[PDB]
Amino acid sequence: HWGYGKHNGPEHWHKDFPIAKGERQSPVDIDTHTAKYDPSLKPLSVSYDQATSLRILNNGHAFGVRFDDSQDKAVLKGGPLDGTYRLCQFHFHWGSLDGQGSEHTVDKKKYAAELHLVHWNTKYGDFGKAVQQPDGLAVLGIFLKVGSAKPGLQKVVDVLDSIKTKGKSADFTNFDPRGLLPESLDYWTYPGSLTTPPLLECVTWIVLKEPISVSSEQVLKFRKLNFNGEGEPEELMVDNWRPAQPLKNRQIKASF
Numbered sequence: 152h153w154g155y156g157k158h159n160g161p162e163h164w165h166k167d168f169p170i171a172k173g174e175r176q177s178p179v180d181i182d183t184h185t186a187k188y189d190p191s192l193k194p195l196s197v198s199y200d201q202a203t204s205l206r207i208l209n210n211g212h213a214f215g216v217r218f219d220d221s222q223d224k225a226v227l228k229g230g231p232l233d234g235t236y237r238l239c240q241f242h243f244h245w246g247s248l249d250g251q252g253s254e255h256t257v258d259k260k261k262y263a264a265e266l267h268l269v270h271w272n273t274k275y276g277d278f279g280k281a282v283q284q285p286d287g288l289a290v291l292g293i294f295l296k297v298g299s300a301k302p303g304l305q306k307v308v309d310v311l312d313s314i315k316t317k318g319k320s321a322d323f324t325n326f327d328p329r330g331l332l333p334e335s336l337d338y339w340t341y342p343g344s345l346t347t348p349p350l351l352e353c354v355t356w357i358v359l360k361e362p363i364s365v366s367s368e369q370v371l372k373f374r375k376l377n378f379n380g381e382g383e384p385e386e387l388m389v390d391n392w393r394p395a396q397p398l399k400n401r402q403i404k405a406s407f
């Protein structure tokens with residue numbers, strides 16, 4: 152029964168998931184004074200040309216899109232990563248206003264939303280095995296700022312009315328996640344965790360320097376979703392973000 156409320160939110164998570172107080176928790180503030188350029192960081196490789204979207208869903212915490220990861224079809228490699236990571240899902244976090252909603256911050260600046268593309272290391276066979284490993288996952292984090300519309304987001308925005316409440320889902324085929332990427336693949340990287348329970352420390356975080364611009368119209372549709380199930384008391388899905396956690400003994404590295 153974890154959530155983002157006063158009574159079940161991030162301050163409570165440690166009681167069921169003690170790793171919430173761990174050494175490699177996410178998200179973090181990225182301080183550009185201490186997130187130092189590492190000239191030895193390779194370019195990120197984002198191979199999404201065969202990406203096969205299956206379904207869109209409200210899981211009661213966010214909404215996201217699931218992909219066919221039975222083959223190498225939509226994969227992350229290079230950058231800080233060893234081997235090949237397959238896209239299972241992407242989802243968003245966002246705020247009760249344009250001023251907040253991102254999980255990562257840059258010099259304590261919050262963006263309107265954050266996109267997470269969630270990939271698992273092929274060497275562990277499936278997603279369930281991979282999350283038990285410190286190198287199990289690679290999550291590509293992308294900031295959303297409000298401005299010009301993102302045409303590659305419109306197909307997602309246009310179906311959110313159909314998944315308003317918790318546990319609703321829809322067939323969602325031929326969605327191209329390349330439409331959600333900024334121009335630049337300059338990135339920060341650090342070892343961390345899932346930002347929701349079970350909060351496992353299995354993630355290589357790759358956060359892009361460049362945010363994508365989405366229109367007010369697009370991000371307002373996000374704030375129409377509900378945490379609650381159909382017929383339960385209404386609870387608008389906003390502020391579904393975990394605040395920055397202590398960096399502790401970790402380094403954040405910049406590709407730029």
Ligand SMILES: [Zn+2]
Pocket residue numbers: 242243244267346
């Ligand atoms: Zn996330």
